[PDB]
Amino acid sequence: ATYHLEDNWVGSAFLSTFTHEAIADPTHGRVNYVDQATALAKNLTYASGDTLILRADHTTTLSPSGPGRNSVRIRSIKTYTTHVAVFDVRHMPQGCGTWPAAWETDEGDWPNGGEVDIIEGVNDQSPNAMTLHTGANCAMPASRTMTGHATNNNCDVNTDGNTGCGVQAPTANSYGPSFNANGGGWYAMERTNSFIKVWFFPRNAGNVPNDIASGPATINTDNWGTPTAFFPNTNCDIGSHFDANNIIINLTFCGDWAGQASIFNGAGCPGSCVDYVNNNPSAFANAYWDIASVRVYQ
Ligand SMILES: *[C@@]1(O[C@@H]2[C@@H](O)[C@H](O)O[C@H](CO)[C@H]2O)O[C@H](CO)[C@@H](O)[C@H](O)[C@H]1O
Ligand SMILES: *[C@@H]1O[C@H](CO)[C@@H](O)[C@H](O)[C@H]1NC(C)=O
Hints:
The PDB classes it as hydrolase. The chain is α+β, with helices and mostly antiparallel strands. Helix content is 15%, strand content 37%. The chain has a single domain, classed as Jelly Rolls, CATH 2.60.120.200.
């Protein structure tokens, strides 16, 4: 469909159009999410020119008894239903223990207002995962047109184990150190009543739609080729499982996914996640988002 620019966020714009959520981490990570004033004072958020940086503290050795590693979780003030969101991302956090995400949800009624994870993973483990989390009666067909690979087809968190219904991107450079070495790329998500789609295009893609790469004020997703992840309405009333969602971009550490010993050690990371995060500040120098723009269309 054809959509038109609704929000154009670059650099300092994010400081007026998002807030920082200074909240206990819902995912129980070894993180201290700071507010906007604190993030700016500590240079954990840097928002100027055509750059937004969102980063972990990479200097403090943590008291094991004290709070987690300082980081940020930013949330759009506006909410969205049928829309397209495009993320031009130069760098995403990397490092053992890291759990970055770019996603949408309604925190106030979770999971009943839905959740779509656009960029997400843990402990540098490529590829990217794109996932819906919903309430009851929302599943995905075994076969549908997309370039990625489905991993779980029941989206209902109550009957899947909060895995959600996920799709793995087909290339390594969708995530992690591989993505960063390649200069990142573009993630786009289209949500309608009938489906959710996510596309990933590498920075060096010869075939990235101009609509995505250059951010004109008018776009037409008919022209974007096959999505990386497709969540059709075959077995899920998409519109009834999602309501008005905020956009969230965050970085946590350890917690309910990344911090599991089998997962953390399985990735080759040493010892316990919490001890690693406490004691290795320098290892988080590359635990940053560098975002060129986020644009929303409706
Ligand atoms: C919930 O957590 C989500 C999780 O479902 C997904 O793996 O990706 C998100 C970002 O990585 C992560 O936050 O978040 C909701 C809303 O904050 C909570 O209600 C819920 O308890 C978390 O599990
Ligand atoms: C804050 O972080 C930015 C981005 O990493 C960096 O370029 C800058 O030098 C830092 N500012 C100060 C005053 O140290």
